[PDB]
RNA sequence: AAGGAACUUUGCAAUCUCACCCCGUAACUUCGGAAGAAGGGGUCCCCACGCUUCGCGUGGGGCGCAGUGAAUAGGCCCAG
RNA sequence: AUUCCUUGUCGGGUAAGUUCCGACCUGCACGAAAGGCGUAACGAUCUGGGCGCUGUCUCAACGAGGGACUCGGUGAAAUU
RNA sequence: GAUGUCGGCUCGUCGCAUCCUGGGGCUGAAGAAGGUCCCAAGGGUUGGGCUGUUCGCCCAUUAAAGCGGCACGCGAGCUGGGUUCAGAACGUCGUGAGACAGUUCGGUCUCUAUCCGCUACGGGCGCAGGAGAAUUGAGGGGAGUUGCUCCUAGUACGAGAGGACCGGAGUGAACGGACCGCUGGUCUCCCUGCUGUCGUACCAACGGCACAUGCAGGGUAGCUAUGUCCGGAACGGAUAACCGCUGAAAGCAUCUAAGCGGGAAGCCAGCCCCAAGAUGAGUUCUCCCACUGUUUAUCAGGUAAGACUCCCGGAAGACCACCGGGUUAAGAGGCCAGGCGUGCACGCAUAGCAAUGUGUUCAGCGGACUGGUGCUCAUCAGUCGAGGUCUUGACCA
């Protein structure tokens, strides 16, 4: 799963290449904006969970920079997620999508496939720019 | 503890054949699991996962196969229950010549 | 040192309340059907070597 | 109230619609009734049901006497059920119904003597920054000259498992009478082959 | 728990060199007395061995030769004993227990073909 | 498994590295060194061909997940 | 490693640094062979940072062996 | 003739001058959000950076990230960073030896628990016959947490901006319990691949050693989480703060002195678990039955019902204990069939200079899994185990 110290890849053109998980929010997207934490614990973030993260390396020229403290929403965990039919998906690398306090990507596009779990999590816009939704 | 005489074995088959499905052969080598994604709004989608077969674990209801695929620059593996309602049909694309029922080695 | 160590000599009594459980159970000898000497149930008669016929050497 | 007796059998996959659901196949063989305790006979209401069959050559005389008092046929297991009744015997037929939430209670597998990490979670200590109290071993047991002793109950190592457990509220996915088979979602206590007792939800939502 | 299914009291190779050593003596001498438990270990193992021998093809010989490193003993099980048990549903080896012993109080026993 | 120093007084401990060929190798320097710096590649089997022979190079072929294929066997760097 | 007030003040690196690096200077109580300042190379030296790897850690699990338990033989100790 | 010292880690438990959830009065309380005081400790109270720290500062969150007590809780539990040994250095004091509000680097923390206490598990006796089994619950333990979204409702309220109580839905977190179907981990020899060496005469095929698996790939049952399933409740009773009905003493007023009602995450019951050594030892159903022994061996001795001993095993287990079988037998092993694991065997044949490839071969091999079958061993036999005190009362012809 994902947890503080866990570096995820960035699947958007936000400008940040790699981010380090600073904290695990309890993914509150809903109602008006993003909702606030469902508890102060919760140790692992799963595809679809929102986390707070620090930026470890960003590309030269791009909205986001090295050091920025941002919010990303986990789209590909190297962990297995178990869809209800009983099937299991698992990507070769953890990777996330940086976002804003509305849950919209900071980037103009998403790279690589995205866990289809983000669709139930209601992150439609993310699903929107997804090349694929495995 | 309760010591009744009984083939707990078959009792399970009887409650398991009703949820067991055969599928083309295959063992590795490519496949194309054209599966349904009824999971969108009402809108019943239709994705096709195709790529190397790396594992056949199980038997009965529990039987399944694992296909590895690289999509959009990122390696992806899926686990399918031969008899998973989301699986419409499976078709071989090309028999492969390997040497061990696994291939995990193939993850590089 | 010898860290834990006892606080007091124990009564000849106490010391015996203890051992109230070390009494051997005598074997439950059976009498061999042939040479009739006593034997140990489920084993061979050390005196005739039988166990229905003669298994062990005389 | 209502309830039956049975042998756990295994778990397995089963799709109810398009959702794969795990279940525990329980054989709730028919259960004879061998004694009705009444608030006017034994001082409280309840039914004596029976389970596995037992060869007669193995039945104590005293027991025969009992079992005969109701021309049943030696079982090997008898158990009571408060405020329960009807006439004849007890089979899941009409007793339980698909969808009913229930409470399966068996005897947990037995773990023998287990330390505190595994019996209570605890946490033991380090593994490198110095020791001999590596992982397991509890910490301290009390305090000091005050309560110059240890609390009744302080969690410690001890025979773990081998207990009566009751997992509440379980949906009954499928009932195949005439096989006295029954599939409950989730997982029931104890080993396959073990006795298990199913009942109305003692207290469900 | 520990609901496994086998025995050791030695490492992994010792426990294999013994079962092979007794397997061979049992077959080379039709009978041997041994600690009660050890015979218990031996019994199934050996029976399996008699059943592998009970095939006559080179393959079945070569397999036996993996757990019977004495050419003479393999020939015996291969040509004298396996053929003899032809008609019995692999079920011959019996254990008789004798008396307890002096040097260590251990109850000995007989395992015979 | 997933994560990867979040442990903790301190990555203590335990991993990684780990041989021999080839290529490649910074600051700074008393020009010796810093260097095994760093980094990358090779390494088995058959055959022909040529070579200074044990051995080796060239080309083609072959097998495994993997070829110092099992034992011996540097973790590296910046700064004070 | 010689600063008390003190985690001094600014800068650096970090999401966040009582530590560390660089400046400043108000050097409680620096200072030139009880040597001053610097200095390549060397260190099982001391300090801070980084890359890689990892059961150090989130949480622990499973396995192995050697004790611990049981039976037969021999049979101590500190203490009191 | 020694009560180990700071901090941490582990383990907790208690107080309330309550940090958060729960209930209330007043507010300068429109609603939303707060403030404040009263009642209330059930449960809960995150993860990091800096420092030996305790503290505190800061990051990122949270319903909240409470304050204290228990020898500033806990070293016969661990650590040993801090500091009140011996080395060394700097600054400072001393002529010196040395020293210090100081600073800094280094520097052995003692297997075996007697008694009480605590967690587990037996043995004895008791519970007025001797037994098999089913139970009541005296009492006692565990649990007791919280968010967010939707609905009501864009309603009541409000100029607007914003925006509810009450009640009804869902979905998480953390914690726990059980479980192994899933997804994974492991699986010390279940299958295969590989190297060096020695051996089985040699070739081929195999074995050993290279951990206490030589290395690697995989892996059933089991065990196991980061995997599953379920759970904290409802209703009820009596209450706290607080609010009230009828109502005098003070012909009015008054939650009050007669009386009566509502009212909290708290108390009691409820839920799960233990439970008659509840020596006040309870209840129910069933079985065995009334033997033998001359004031010389005064009581034990044959026995019934039943059970133990012993053997063979177990999803039970340290040992005991517990469950199953013990030939009128399917208990375990073997054996057969099947499952599942590994991945195509040895031999031969063919292709090739060969290394190898292909065919025979979805081969071969085979731990624990499902069944079947008397092939094996549970043989034989022994030991123990009732004849029921007395008083009162009630019923029987
Ligand atoms: Mg698997
Ligand atoms: Mg631990
Ligand atoms: Mg410097
Ligand atoms: Mg002894
Ligand atoms: Mg309030
Ligand atoms: Mg102490
Ligand atoms: Mg292995
Ligand atoms: Mg009330
Ligand atoms: Mg035993
Ligand atoms: Mg029995
Ligand atoms: Mg079997």
Swiss-Prot record, chain B:
Record GO cellular component, one term: cytosolic large ribosomal subunit
Record bears the keyword Metal-binding: no
Keywords of this entry: Ribonucleoprotein, Ribosomal protein, RNA-binding, rRNA-binding
Gene Ontology biological process: translation
Lineage top rank: taxon: Bacteria
Gene Ontology MF annotations: rRNA binding; structural constituent of ribosome
Keyword flag RNA-binding: yes
Function of the molecule: This protein is located at the 30S-50S ribosomal subunit interface and may play a role in the structure and function of the aminoacyl-tRNA binding site. Binds the 23S rRNA.
Family, similarity comment: Belongs to the bacterial ribosomal protein bL19 family.
Assembly behavior: Part of the 50S ribosomal subunit. Forms a cluster with proteins L3 and L14.
Name listed for the protein in its UniProt record: Large ribosomal subunit protein bL19
Organism of derivation: Deinococcus radiodurans (strain ATCC 13939 / DSM 20539 / JCM 16871 / CCUG 27074 / LMG 4051 / NBRC 15346 / NCIMB 9279 / VKM B-1422 / R1)
Organismal lineage: Bacteria, Thermotogati, Deinococcota, Deinococci, Deinococcales
Swiss-Prot record, chain C:
Gene name of the encoded protein: rpmF
Protein name: Large ribosomal subunit protein bL32
Keyword terms of this UniProt record: Metal-binding, Ribonucleoprotein, Ribosomal protein, RNA-binding, rRNA-binding, Zinc, Zinc-finger
Required co-factors: Zn(2+)
GO MF term list: rRNA binding; structural constituent of ribosome; zinc ion binding
Function recorded in the entry: Forms a cluster with L17 and L22, and with L22, a pair of 'tweezers' that hold together all the domains of the 23S rRNA. Interacts with the antibiotic troleandomycin which blocks the peptide exit tunnel.
Organism in which the protein naturally occurs: Deinococcus radiodurans (strain ATCC 13939 / DSM 20539 / JCM 16871 / CCUG 27074 / LMG 4051 / NBRC 15346 / NCIMB 9279 / VKM B-1422 / R1)
Gene Ontology BP annotations: translation
Cofactor note: Binds 1 zinc ion per subunit.
C4-type zinc finger segments: 32-48
PANTHER family: 50S RIBOSOMAL PROTEIN L32 (PTHR35534), LARGE RIBOSOMAL SUBUNIT PROTEIN BL32 (PTHR35534:SF1)
Curated annotation (Swiss-Prot), chain D:
Region (Disordered): 125-148
Name this polypeptide is given: Large ribosomal subunit protein uL3
Protein family according to the UniProt entry: Belongs to the universal ribosomal protein uL3 family.
Source lineage: Bacteria, Thermotogati, Deinococcota, Deinococci, Deinococcales
Record bears the keyword Nucleotidyltransferase: no
Cross-referenced PANTHER family: 50S RIBOSOMAL PROTEIN L3, LARGE RIBOSOMAL SUBUNIT PROTEIN UL3C
Example of a GO cellular component annotation carried by this entry: cytosolic large ribosomal subunit
Keyword annotations: Ribonucleoprotein, Ribosomal protein, RNA-binding, rRNA-binding
Assembly and oligomerization: Part of the 50S ribosomal subunit. Forms a cluster with proteins L14 and L19. Also contacts proteins L13 and L17.
Source species of the chain: Deinococcus radiodurans (strain ATCC 13939 / DSM 20539 / JCM 16871 / CCUG 27074 / LMG 4051 / NBRC 15346 / NCIMB 9279 / VKM B-1422 / R1)
Disulfide bond residue pairs: none
Highest taxon of source: Bacteria
Function description: One of the primary rRNA binding proteins, it binds directly near the 3'-end of the 23S rRNA, where it nucleates assembly of the 50S subunit.
GO biological process: translation
Keyword Ribonucleoprotein in record: yes
GO molecular function, one term: rRNA binding
Pfam families documented for this protein: Ribosomal_L3
Encoding gene per record: rplC
UniProtKB/Swiss-Prot annotation, chain E:
Molecular function GO terms recorded: rRNA binding; structural constituent of ribosome
Record carries keyword Glycosyltransferase: no
SUPFAM superfamilies listed in its UniProt record: Prokaryotic ribosomal protein L17
Biological processes annotated in GO: translation
Keywords assigned by UniProt, alphabetized: Ribonucleoprotein, Ribosomal protein, RNA-binding, rRNA-binding
A Pfam match: Ribosomal_L17
PROSITE patterns for the chain: RIBOSOMAL_L17
Entry GO terms, CC: cytosolic large ribosomal subunit
Family: Belongs to the bacterial ribosomal protein bL17 family.
Function of the protein: Binds to the 23S rRNA.
Subunit structure comment from the entry: Part of the 50S ribosomal subunit. Contacts proteins L3 and L32.
Name listed for the protein in its UniProt record: Large ribosomal subunit protein bL17
Source organism: Deinococcus radiodurans (strain ATCC 13939 / DSM 20539 / JCM 16871 / CCUG 27074 / LMG 4051 / NBRC 15346 / NCIMB 9279 / VKM B-1422 / R1)
Gene label: rplQ
